[PDB]
A = this chain, B = another copy of it.
Amino acid sequence: SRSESSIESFFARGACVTIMTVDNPASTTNKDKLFAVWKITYKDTVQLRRKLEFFTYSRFDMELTFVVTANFTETNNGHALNQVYQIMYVPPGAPVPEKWDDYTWQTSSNPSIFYTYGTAPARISVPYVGISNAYSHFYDGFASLNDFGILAVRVVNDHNPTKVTSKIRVYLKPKHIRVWCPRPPRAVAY
């Protein structure tokens, strides 16, 4: 008896990987400027990272889920309608979005997900997008790692007098995962 200790069952957990921060100002709040860009990496959090580091290589179907929370910032009695968000997965190495305005945001080829607030958190499947036969946890030769694309998020609704702050939580569940050579674990801090 050992099923709940198998590779699939060791990683069959959803773990927080990042918390993107966007907003809907009625003015010049260009830091978020409604958008935030995040380079998709496991390396930002530590729990998921170490779990994946007991090995050197791995193939993994990656299933993301997006929980979006909102709130008013200024102590105002101001209102707002239920907002829509756009979450884009930009496939590995493609034009990186800056401004919330620019062409890139029309993504003929890249996927996109519109999420209406108040419903069940968003969810997408990305197959093994490795450029190699396996993803290289640690890499040797002559960081960038392997790359898993980038996530861009903006408020689509237009500038509302009442400024609204939002936070998109990303969760990564690696599914149908296999691994290769095993190295001793990272004892210390990263």
Bound-state Cα–Cα, A165 to B160, Å: 10
Q: Does A114 contact B (CB under 8 A)?
A: yes
* Partner pick for A161 among B13, B48, B69, B72, CB 8 A cutoff: B72
Q: Does A159 contact B (CB under 8 A)?
A: yes
Chain A residues 57 to 75 lying within 8 A of chain B, measured CB to CB, are 67, 69-72, 74-75
By a CB distance below 8 angstroms, the chain B residues around A13 are: 108-109
Q: Does A179 contact B (CB under 8 A)?
A: no
Query: Chain A: interface secondary structure?
Result: loop
- Smallest CB separation, A125 vs chain B (Å): 15
Q: Are B81 and A78 in contact (CB under 8 A)?
A: no
Copies in the complex: 2
Number of interface residues of A (CB under 8 A): 42
Q: Are B116 and A72 in contact (CB under 8 A)?
A: no
Q: Known interface pairs A77-B79, A116-B119, A167-B158. Does A106 touch B71 (Cβ–Cβ under 8 Å)?
A: no
Q: Does A29 contact B (CB under 8 A)?
A: no
Q: Are B82 and A79 in contact (CB under 8 A)?
A: no
Residues of A within 8 A of B (CB): 13, 15-16, 26, 45, 47-48, 51, 67, 69-72, 74-84, 106, 108-109, 114, 116-121, 156-161, 165, 167
